[PDB]
Design a protein around this ligand. Structure first.
Ligand SMILES: [Zn+2]
Lengths: 287, 32, 741
């Protein structure tokens, strides 16, 4: 009767509440709760997230307001769905993810009340480009000091999802808390409505951008393509046995012969065909 | 031998039509 | 065709005759004049090897058996090469009752052995029903396959070549990690079917260190060691009952029930009823695993209804942890069934549940409910691939594997690999490129050519299932082109694809010495290197310790082959290998590879009990191979010196000292000598005529180069060029020398 390599399901609606509320209070380490359902032994899901009003103390047990707790829970019972809290989260701007000394005390409070009460750490200002620095953790006992901490078992999906990173194992990993895996309860009718509604253009699909800047851009490429063709003349008529496999490798420069070549030929091709093909269709369609 | 050579040419021909297919498919999907 | 009759060469005639689908022209070319009546032996292999369709294949196969019955002697090859494909139960029972009727119990005794080895479950259960419709009780046992098991048990208890120290040199290098499970799966593999208990005896406190699921795995390993141990195993694990081990340990009693299933697989008896009555009276959770895994394993391929009913109400408990237990066992009892209710209830149940363990157990189960249907699955094949559940798309990829086993379908390999490139989840990309070997294992020439470029992809998941595709397509051959591909695969940066390269390397080269293929000793020390390194990954070295257990499995005496002896394909060796690949999601599924451990033996049992001690030999071409000596050479090295490089005035000082010996050595006394070429003398007159008794290990390579003693009078019955079991044609008189330990 001990832990495994578990799994955490977060909803798509949760994640947008997470890193918007973190981006809102970017200097001041925002705080919120995590509301889901312990579905079995070693998977867990969370469907919903609401925030917390911020105190002068910061992320601690005192920022948990019990009168804001029960009143917010009450007005979610009759509208939407009532369920149990399953954890909490906070924002660490200046660094990626690890439980601090005040973070570890408020984890003790919830794991004594609840079953496991998974924490979540989100860095909003690091999570920028195409990846999110979000991680979830769980506090481990000191009673298993003569036994295997992280009591994992019969599975081969522990070596995936992260090796324990050096900036996180310098803190209480892996002798105070352990990491836990995250994948997304991702479904159709939410995937397609976020795809098709954020990036779409209907009447733009047959516009013209007409010709005063299009045919001007047809001058804008050809001119240096002339000079780059003269540079293409230079290397090909050179053609000396200067050990030519070494002569090609000592002058890689993202440069003339093929790299700075037909790339332009592609852009001249794609711009003019899509222009002229849309021009012939508008004559066809409109009378 | 004159019949057994004929089927072995067919089986290889069916095979290396499949391998030229998905490599042409994979190279398309690899550009993305 | 009359010109092909005027040819006098009729293989030119038989080409067009099978092109235009005409069959009286087929019959006349073999019932022609006396021009090599073994044209049927050409036509059988022609229909065996390169016939794609099955619609007229049986028709050509049954117009063959018209001339086999019209041939002089009926028995020998025609039944187990044609009728088991043609699956006629009562045709076999009647003509074998004919063979008993003329008092010919010598070759009917042969064909029952060859039937039990080749043909499948429920074809033998159907014919033995029409048997009983004595020497009749003699052909009950050898068609129920009783005494074939104990002689197979007799072979492995006599022969045992395992080095104990190899597992000792891996045991001491195990730290406080969970590599204890990796060690107890290793010795279970290389003592499988051996009934040898020493590692569960001597380091017993070390075995009690790991816990809480290794207790489940280790007592499951105990059933692997006692594979095929019919009566003696039930009284053996009449010590470790589901009510006498511990009231606090359910993992002990749960894995005990799973160990009974591992022993009595493909064997119906009271143990099906015994395990059924303890799923009636069951404890809470983890008695219901090894009960259900054991019960579905003993009832595999039986299509038994009463066990199938309670496995449904076990499945509809909606318990989280027995869902993997129920869904695997629900497929095993309906293996190759193509039921209406089974597919519908399992694909129905696969959406309203809210876990995915329950999906992964039913993933393999609905893939395994259909088996070798070859066209009859395509409505289900298409429906599982279209759905938005990634596990259910993944399960459809296992289903198109198991329905098209051993067929060169272009429609398979197109559709199976189009999703391998295109699909967005990575787990379904693996099970796509893991299904490559299941459909191409019969012709191993193609699998190096098609997976080599997929082994160099950009994501590791394609590169993982590329490696285990080599492990299953080329099963136990000395291919060496797959080995040529696996050399950078085991040197990958990513850890788990190194793991898969180690395990696939262990599969390809079981029972192969250095002279068989040169890369054996390269990889054995390579296994030793990455298991004794301290700064490698646990998951990377998990495959290394498991590669130790595969490589010497059964004391170099069993092998793995999806292909069987007589051209037929195994149902256990296919099921045993693919559920073994589900060791990512559940480590205790690793015991199922012991189902594919087929023996490497020849036994000359001629009567029911009479195995005479007959010495017969092989004729290996320049030298010997086969089943080497253990290696006890740890080290003893010495630093002992640093060489004095003083090239000062010493140089003239030593030279005038050598002048001082030219007065002392050659002028007083010197004589000492030794003899050459004694050690060269004994090497060249060597054998390559090594006689063997008949418990006889034999490599599947050297089946063709062994020879009966023609100077001995006792000759066999079947052409002795292939391993398994044959009977002796005992000629004269005065038979003695029976042996049983
Ligand atoms: Zn914090």
């Amino acid at each position: 009767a001990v832990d495994t390599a578990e799994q955490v399901y977060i909803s798509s609606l949760a994640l947008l509440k997470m890193l918007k509320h973190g981006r809102a209070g970017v200097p001041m380490e925002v705080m919120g709760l995590m509301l889901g359902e312990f579905v079995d032994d070693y998977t867990v899901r969370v469907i919903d997230v609401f925030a917390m009003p911020q105190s002068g103390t910061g992320v601690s047990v005192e920022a948990v307001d019990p009168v804001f707790q029960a009143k917010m829970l009450d007005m979610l019972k009759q509208t939407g769905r009532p369920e149990m809290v399953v954890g909490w989260y906070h924002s660490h701007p200046g660094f990626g993810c690890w439980l601090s000394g005040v973070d570890i005390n408020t984890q003790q409070s919830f794991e004594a009340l609840s079953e496991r009460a998974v924490a979540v750490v989100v860095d909003p200002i690091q999570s920028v480009k195409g990846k999110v620095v979000i991680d979830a953790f769980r506090l481990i006992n000191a009673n298993m000091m003569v036994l295997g901490h992280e009591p994992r078992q019969t599975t081969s999906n522990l070596g995936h999802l992260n090796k324990p990173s050096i900036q996180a194992l310098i803190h209480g990993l892996n002798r105070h808390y352990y990491s836990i895996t995250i994948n997304y309860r991702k479904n159709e009718l939410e995937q397609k409505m976020l795809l098709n509604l954020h990036k779409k253009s209907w009447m733009e699909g047959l516009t013209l951008q007409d010709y005063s800047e299009h045919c001007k851009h047809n001058e804008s490429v050809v001119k240096e393509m002339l000079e780059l063709a003269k540079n293409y003349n230079k290397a090909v008529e050179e053609e000396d046995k200067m050990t030519p496999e070494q002569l090609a490798i000592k002058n890689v420069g993202k440069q003339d012969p093929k790299r700075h070549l037909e790339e332009h030929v592609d852009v001249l091709m794609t711009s003019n065909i899509v222009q002229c093909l849309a021009a012939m269709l508008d004559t066809v369609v409109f009378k | 031998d004159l019949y057994s050579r004929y089927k072995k040419l067919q089986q290889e021909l069916e095979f290396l039509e499949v391998q030229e297919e998905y490599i042409k498919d994979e190279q398309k999907n690899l550009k993305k | 065709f009359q010109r092909c009759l005027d040819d006098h060469k009729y293989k030119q005639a038989i080409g067009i005759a099978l092109e235009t689908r005409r069959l009286d022209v087929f019959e006349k070319t073999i019932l022609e004049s006396n021009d090599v009546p073994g044209m049927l032996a050409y036509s059988l292999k022609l229909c065996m090897s390169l016939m794609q369709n099955k619609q007229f294949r049986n028709k050509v196969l049954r117009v063959l058996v018209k001339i086999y019955m019209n041939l002089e002697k009926p028995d020998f090859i025609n039944v187990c090469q044609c009728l088991i494909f043609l699956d006629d139960p009562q045709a076999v029972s009647d003509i074998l009752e004919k063979l008993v009727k003329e008092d010919n119990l010598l070759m009917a005794y042969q064909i029952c052995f060859d039937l039990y080895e080749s043909a499948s479950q429920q074809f033998l259960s159907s014919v033995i029903q029409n048997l009983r419709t004595d020497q009749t009780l003699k052909m009950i046992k050898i068609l129920s396959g009783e005494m074939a098991i104990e002689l197979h048990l007799q072979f492995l208890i006599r022969n045992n070549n395992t080095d104990l120290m190899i597992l000792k040199n891996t045991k001491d290098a195990v730290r406080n990690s969970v590599c204890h499970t990796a060690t107890v799966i290793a010795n279970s593999f290389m003592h499988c079917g051996t009934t040898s208990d020493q590692f569960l005896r001597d380091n017993l406190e070390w075995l009690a260190r790991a816990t809480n699921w290794a207790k489940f795995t280790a007592t499951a390993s105990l059933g692997v060691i006692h594979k095929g141990h019919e009566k003696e195993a039930l009284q053996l694990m009449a010590t470790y009952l589901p009510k006498d081990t511990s009231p606090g340990s359910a993992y002990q009693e749960g894995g005990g029930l799973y160990a009974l299933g591992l022993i009595h697989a493909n064997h119906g008896g009271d143990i099906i009823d015994y395990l059924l009555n303890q799923l009636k009276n069951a404890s809470n959770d983890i008695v219901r695993h090894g009960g259900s895994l054991g019960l579905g394993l003993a009832a595999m391929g039986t299509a038994r209804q009463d066990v199938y009913d309670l496995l449904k109400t076990n499945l509809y408990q909606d318990d989280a942890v027995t869902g993997e237990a129920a869904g695997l066992a629900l497929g095993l009892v309906m293996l190759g069934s193509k039921n209406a209710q089974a597919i519908e209830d399992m694909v129905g149940y696969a959406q309203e549940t809210q876990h995915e363990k329950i999906l992964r157990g039913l993933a393999v189960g609905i893939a395994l409910v259909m088996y070798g249907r070859m066209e009859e699955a395509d409505a289900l094949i298409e429906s599982l691939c279209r759905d938005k559940d990634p596990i259910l798309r993944r399960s459809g990829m296992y289903t198109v594997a198991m329905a098209y086993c051993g067929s060169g379908n272009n429609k398979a390999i197109r559709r199976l690999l189009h999703v391998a490139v295109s699909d967005v989840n990575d787990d379904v990309r693996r099970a796509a490129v893991e299904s490559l070997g299941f459909i191409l294992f019969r012709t191993p020439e193609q699998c190096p050519s098609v997976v080599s470029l997929l082994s160099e992809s950009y994501n590791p998941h394609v590169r993982y299932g590329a490696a285990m595709a080599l492990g299953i397509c080329c099963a136990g051959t000395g291919n060496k082109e797959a080995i040529n591909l696996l050399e950078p695969m085991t040197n990958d940066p990513v850890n788990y694809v190194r793991q898969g390269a180690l395990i696939a390397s262990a599969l390809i080269m079981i029972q192969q010495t250095e002279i068989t293929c040169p890369k054996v000793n390269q990889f054995r020390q390579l296994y030793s290197k990455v298991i004794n390194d301290k700064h490698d990954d646990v998951m990377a070295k998990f495959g290394a310790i498991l590669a130790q257990g595969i490589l010497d499995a059964g004391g170099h005496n069993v092998t793995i082959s999806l292909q069987s002896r007589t051209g037929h394909t195994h149902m256990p060796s296919v099921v045993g290998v693919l559920v073994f690949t589900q060791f990512w999601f559940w480590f205790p599924l690793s015991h199922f590879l012991s189902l594919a451990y087929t023996p490497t033996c020849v036994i000359g049992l001629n009567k029911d009990l009479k195995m005479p001690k007959v010495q017969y030999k092989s004729n290996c071409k320049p030298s010997t191979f086969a089943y080497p000596a253990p290696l006890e050479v740890p080290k003893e090295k010495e630093k002992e010196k640093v060489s004095t490089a003083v090239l000062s005035i010493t140089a003239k000082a030593k030279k005038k000292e050598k002048e001082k010996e030219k007065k002392e050595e050659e002028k007083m006394e010197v004589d000492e000598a030794e003899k050459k070429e004694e050690k060269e003398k004994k090497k060249e007159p060597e054998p390559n005529f090594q006689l063997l008794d008949n418990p006889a290990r034999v490599m599947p390579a050297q089946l063709k180069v062994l020879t009966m003693p023609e100077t001995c009078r006792y000759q066999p019955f079947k052409p002795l060029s292939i391993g398994g079991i044959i009977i002796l044609k005992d000629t004269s008189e005065d038979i003695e020398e029976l042996v049983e330990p």
